[PDB]
Write a protein that binds this DNA or RNA. Structure first.
Ligand SMILES: [Zn+2]
Ligand SMILES: [Zn+2]
Lengths: 286, 178, 113, 113, 178, 282
DNA sequence: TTTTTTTTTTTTTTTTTTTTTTTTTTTT
């Protein structure tokens, strides 16, 4: 079969299931309770081919039959397995009575192991890719955040500790906030980057930003005033840079559409030129 | 609102017709020879001379050449910082407001940053694509204007052909200028 | 009022007599570190580029903007700007130069007021 | 209550569909030390024996007790017990197998209470 | 006295009728389907699983398969040593007392030792020979029991035909069990 | 003849008697009384060859004929003599009318089932399973008679009641039971045969017995303990024992095994095939 | 041919901070 892990989908015919993968992870076998009250065994592995990864779940006698025979780095071939949706929406291979596994198979596969213009953007838009120029820098600042939920933590002066409303006493991490604007030639949209993505774009450490914010606040400025000042005085160099942002669009009750960018990346010029060539062909140029 | 920065050749800015808004809050704009209303400009060129910073730091300026024209880029007061960023020879992308001083169009710097040579190529491709798109739309809009003018009937006809109502007003304004 | 003449984009083999400031893109094949000159090959010819301060490296792909100097020794370019064009897609640049050559004169000629 | 099914003594050529655990006796003709499999020839056929840990030597006479595995690639035996039958009198074993086949059903049928 | 260990198929032990002696000193025995009174068993099979030694070393056990049946072999206290001797895959000969636990017959290990494959062949030959010898004698004894029962006349007739007096008692006891 | 003195036996055919020997001793001729009341003569000599010694008894005219002709160191050849058992159970050569002597000659010189076994049985072969291990121990023995030697603390030497001051050898004793499916019998192995079956040296067994005795156990208690704790692995093994059956006044029949050997499986299968043929199987 | 002597038997088991969007004019 030429089938790849990327082609698996939940509820696909087990008779079509024929994939190979190298074992990346093996988890310990576990007990589980059956509907009849008895106790069975279940064990999970993670495998991958040239296309992607899949969880492989060995059930009951399949654990005794194969689990100790498999090791990390080995390749297995999986046949006739049921495909289920994992808790993260991804395909998993269930090795029940019907399924088979071939250890280190003889198989040829073994050796191989949305763009939207700003003018079209709407409120609540999800997974939008926008390529444009950084046009304005609103605010640059850092706040103490919980390392788990990334929410703002409060300093308790009575106990001398940092308190997260969700996780209690935590060790705070410095979270960077970058608010700017982006222009694509057909529209303008506000953009917000957080932590590691913002630090990567700014090219300055969050600890260094915190020190500069402190100097500004000591001079008689509030947190709001100091954040706007640092963006204009030190991070104005970022304006004019062409970037690709991906995120979801939320509508602020006065600020308008704000693009909460999950990631940013440098422009792939050949990809962009190909998009333009498509548009030129539509106009009757080529 | 905040209107878009139009990607253009420097030649198209230079040959345009600057329009000074009489209101103290109204944005100035330019109308190109192809009836394009432009509030902000987005250009990609080379810094041809070492920047000029006034001793008193009241203004800073630098020159950009894109092959089709040469334009000055100005930053005033603390905005002089923009001119300090660049150096002679840098290949940069500039966004800003179009201004006219001494009957010569120029760019009031909003942002300037160094670009990869492939960005200059991407800029040329986008500039040409947008130009063709605009010319073809303006040609149809000009025919509508010559036949009906600015009427309720012509506005309906313009929407049906994918032309914005604002385009007919730009044509009328350009005819008034010329 | 001698306004700065924009650099005219040319190939070494297509340089005209009336050209005073040009933009050339090529590969460095020889660098003379004593007379501050270098040899640029674009595929269509070789031009001798006289530089004031910036000397590129041999084998480096560079874009040169310069004034043409016509003397008894030949035609040499007095380099004004030398940019590193090492990661530049010259195939794409060549394609856009041909698109501009074909379409720009037609777009200007479409104006029937 | 799944009590352990005794290993049914068979020849490779006489293996039945309903057989789940068998006892085979033969000579090793090939050993794959990477896939942990070996080829057993008893005189009546050749069976592919998949072993977990014990791999015999080529030419060794062995007795294998294993579970039958029926897949798309064929019928292979997952070996549970592999014993050295090198000095075993297979002629005598064959003779006793025939004696049991003939006499055991008759002995059970003699019971007239 | 010390009675003999009877060489049998595991199937014959499993299908038998265990008899618990009510006396604290009387030996327990089994009566097979062919009316064979067995005090001790002598079997030859393969150890199918790695032995089971209780962490507290109170008991040790191992499984033996002979082709006709599968039986557990148990050693208690220090007798756990017997189970430690063997390993999965060993071809062994076992002698011991027959026991019944949870209505399943088993062997209380008296001795276990590894055997040559030809001993397994010898065991099969002896087991079959003894079985035929016993069945033919029990068939004649059953006819005597059905005609006369357990009388002084039937005991004389049994001795004349090479049948032990004990065999008639075993038949009567088996009829009482069934 | 190649016959040796060691091959003589009482009542053997005098026609087969042909031995040579050097004269070691000559005793004086004596008179003896005949059944008829007359008085005869008799004289005895001791001779030996490369194999052993024999008394030679010259009767009546054989004394006059040969006695003075023979001397110590001379070799004689004896023919046609009657062989009798001496008072010590050994062969003697009787030189009567029929016999001849040549002075300084020219001469170059069963399988039984345990259920059938009885007390006093000799040369019995029994094939069965080792069922029990009674005792394992080693004792100091005489290298000649193999009997228990006594250590004398006054002289610091080992004394054998038959051979005197001897160098003791460690003798292994193995007491076990054997079962053949038709019966059970006790078995005893000694020295080299026992060491071969046990697979442990007698010196190593002596060391283990010493450790047990030091702990507060007697020789009897230590021997039973070592058999159960270390030699229990021997139980379940099928073997062939050969020996004579003696009846103990409380322990019952004990088979004193002269030798033990591994079972010849093909020989045993052939015996079973014979029994199957008798039953009408083949 | 040997040491030293009391035969055998039952029963026991496990996703974030904090919130008011954009805009003109100034130049040696
Ligand atoms: Zn938290
Ligand atoms: Zn002695």
């Amino acid at each position: 079969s030429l089938m790849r892990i990327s082609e698996l989908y939940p509820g696909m015919d087990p008779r079509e299931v024929n994939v190979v993968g190298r074992v990346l992870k093996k988890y310990p076998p576990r007990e589980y309770t059956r509907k009849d009250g008895s106790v069975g065994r279940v064990a999970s592995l993670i495998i991958y081919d040239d296309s992607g990864r899949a969880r492989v779940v060995l059930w009951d006698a399949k654990v005794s039959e194969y689990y100790n025979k498999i090791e990390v780095g080995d390749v297995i071939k999986v046949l006739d397995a049921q495909v289920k949706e994992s808790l993260s929406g991804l395909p998993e291979l269930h090795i029940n009575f019907r399924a088979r596994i071939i250890l280190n198979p003889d198989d040829p596969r073994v050796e191989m192991i949305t763009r939207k213009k700003i003018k079209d953007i709407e409120a609540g838009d999800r997974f939008v890719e926008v390529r444009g120029t950084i046009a304005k820098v609103y605010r640059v600042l850092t706040y103490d955040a919980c390392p788990e939920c990334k929410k703002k933590v409060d300093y308790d002066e009575g106990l001398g500790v940092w308190i997260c409303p969700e996780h209690g006493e935590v060790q705070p991490i410095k979270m960077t906030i970058l608010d700017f604007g982006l222009d694509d030639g057909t529209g303008y949209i506000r953009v917000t980057l957080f932590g590691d993505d913002a630090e990567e774009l700014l090219g300055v450490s969050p600890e260094e930003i915190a020190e500069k914010i402190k100097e500004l606040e000591e001079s008689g400025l509030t947190t709001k005033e100091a954040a706007r000042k640092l963006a204009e005085d030190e991070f104005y160099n970022i304006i004019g840079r062409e970037i690709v942002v991906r995120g979801n669009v939320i509508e602020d009750r006065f600020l308008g559409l704000i693009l909460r960018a999950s990631s940013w990346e440098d422009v792939d010029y050949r990809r962009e030129i190909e998009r333009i060539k498509e548009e030129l062909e539509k106009l009757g140029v080529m | 609102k905040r209107m878009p920065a139009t990607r253009l050749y420097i030649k198209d800015i230079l040959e345009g017709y600057f329009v000074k808004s009489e209101g103290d809050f109204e944005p100035n704009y330019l109308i190109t020879k192809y009836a394009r209303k432009v509030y902000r400009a987005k250009i990609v060129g080379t810094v041809v001379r070492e920047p000029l910073i006034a001793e008193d730091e009241t203004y800073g300026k630098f020159q950009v050449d894109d092959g089709t024209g040469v334009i000055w880029v100005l930053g005033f007061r603390d905005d002089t910082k923009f001119a300090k960023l660049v150096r002679k020879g840098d290949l940069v992308q500039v966004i800003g407001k179009i201004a006219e001083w001494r009957d010569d169009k120029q760019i009031l710097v909003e942002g300037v940053s160094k670009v990869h040579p492939n960005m200059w190529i991407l800029h040329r491709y986008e500039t040409l694509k947008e130009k063709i798109e605009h010319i073809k739309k303006a040609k149809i809009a000009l025919e509508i204007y010559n036949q009906y003018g600015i009427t309720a009937k012509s506005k309906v006809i313009a929407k049906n052909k994918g032309i914005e109502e604002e385009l007919l007003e730009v044509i009328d304004e350009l005819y008034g200028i010329m | 009022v001698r306004r700065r003449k924009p650099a005219v984009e040319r190939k070494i083999s297509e340089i005209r007599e009336e050209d005073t400031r040009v933009s050339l893109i090529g590969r460095v094949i020889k660098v003379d570190k004593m007379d501050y000159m270098f040899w640029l090959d674009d595929g269509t010819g070789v031009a001798i580029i006289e530089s004031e301060s910036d000397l590129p490296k041999v084998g480096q792909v560079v874009r040169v903007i310069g004034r043409i100097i016509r003397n008894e020794e030949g035609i040499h370019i007095y380099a004004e700007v030398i940019q590193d064009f090492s990661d530049a897609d010259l195939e794409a640049l060549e394609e856009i130069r041909e698109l501009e050559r074909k379409l720009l004169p037609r777009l200007e000629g479409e104006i029937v007021w």
